[PDB]
């Protein structure tokens with residue numbers, strides 16, 4: 001497979017968003033993955049509504065600002081027959097009653113694919129599909145203060161993930177330790193966090209922070 005992938009250069013990726021103080025990481029991960037697959041299909045990049053997911057995908061198992069899962073979001077879009085655009089259903093960082101309106105739907109999916117729990121399988125998916133939804137252990141102060149370089153947290157867990165994010169590619173850069181490979185990850189904490197809102201997370205370092213343990217994408 002390729003040594004370097006960046007789906008932002010192919011037009012698959014919207015700008016970095018900010019979930020605020022709502023526990024809706026799962027919705028931002030899911031919209032990011034669906035934005036990529038919809039672009040793959042139609043050639044149009046349209047920002048999608050996280051609030052739509054927060055308010056409306058409870059029946060699929062999500063819990064609004066109290067948490068959720070990207071697969072449940074993908075199941076909602078399939079079950080519901082649509083998902084509204086960001087512009088039409090903007091983000092409020094709080095859970096309200098469902099206000100979905102199919103007239104303003106701009107996306108659909110026919111299910112989702114869970115990737116085997118191996119970084120090699122994740123690499124194949126990123127290389128051939130587009131941006132991929134992933135879960136990571138972000139529960140460390142080092143992640144809060146990340147600025148640049150390849151993120152490696154020795155206390156990171158590969159089994160207990162708490163934050164859904166989006167892999168938009170992978171690459172390499174020479175480092176002191178010769179652990180040079182990284183996943184290119186879009187976060188949802190605004191562009192002031194990390195490197196314009198992105199983090200390079202250690203790749204092929206024993207599933208660091210669990211990035212390959214719960215990876216998936218929607219079928220479009």
Ligand SMILES: *[C@@H](C(=O)OCC)[C@H](O)C(=O)N[C@@H](CC(C)C)C(=O)NCCC(C)C
Nearest residue numbers: 023024025026063067068135161162163164
């Ligand atoms: C993620 C978030 O906003 O983190 C703060 C930045 C949420 O807390 C969240 O939904 N977490 C989620 C696991 C992620 C998606 C890997 C979770 O804890 N889900 C629990 C089960 C769910 C069915 C309610």
